[PDB]
Design a protein that fits this description.
part of a larger assembly; 4 chains; 97 residues; mainly beta; two-stranded antiparallel sheet; Spike protein S1 (chain D)
Chain lengths: 97, 49, 49, 49
């Protein structure tokens, strides 16, 4: 999901299922890996504290200027055509160079 | 109008700055509900009187 | 307190992330008017009863 | 126009990309661990290259 050799395109974004496993995201704060990291429906630091039922990941690559439009309700050339987020979307958005 | 109706979920999910926003929306709605409840109960109590 | 008082207009001009906020403001105001109206209706109901 | 009682200036240098995380309620390495701003903080943030 994070360290995969090659992510799939946003046109055909990989459909990954994460279940029956321990989710530990302290690695992001335990090592400087990703430049951009934000959460909308939850707290970045409480992801480990709070346990979810079915955690799902979405991997894709887009242009740098297209990152700002990756969020709930956003509109643009990427949001409204290939990959979009629900307006009531609950999750986090991760980006790095 | 919040993400969830449970204050525990809000506290366990969002950081303070957004946690107070969600909890404030919940307080606003729930306080309007209780305000209407008390007004209707006062009218009913006046009728009972 | 919203930008506009028409739902078709607010949908048309604004994107959904802010359109929903403005619609929430308008909904809160229009409800609040409803609870006003109903409370004075109940008060006139008590006096006329 | 608005005159303050006691003004305290905190001067520090951080990564170029960590400036956006320096504000009340923001998250990040410095913000969360090293230098944090109060959620209800009243003030201004200034940065330059």
């Amino acid at each position: 999901v994070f360290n995969a050799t090659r992510f799939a395109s946003v046109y055909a974004w990989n459909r990954k299922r994460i279940s029956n496993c321990v989710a530990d995201y302290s690695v992001l704060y335990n090592s400087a890996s990703f430049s951009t990291f934000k959460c909308y429906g939850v707290s970045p630091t409480k992801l480990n504290d709070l346990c979810f039922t079915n955690v799902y990941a979405d991997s894709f690559v887009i242009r740098g200027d297209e990152v700002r439009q990756i969020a709930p309700g956003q509109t643009g050339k990427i949001a409204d055509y290939n990959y979009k987020l629900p307006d009531d979307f609950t999750g986090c958005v991760i980006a790095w160079n | 109008g919040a993400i969830s109706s449970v204050l525990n979920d809000i506290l366990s999910r969002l950081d303070p700055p957004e946690a107070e926003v969600q909890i404030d929306r919940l307080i606003t709605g729930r306080l309007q509900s209780l305000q209407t409840y008390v007004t209707q109960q006062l009218i009913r109590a006046a009728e009972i009187r």
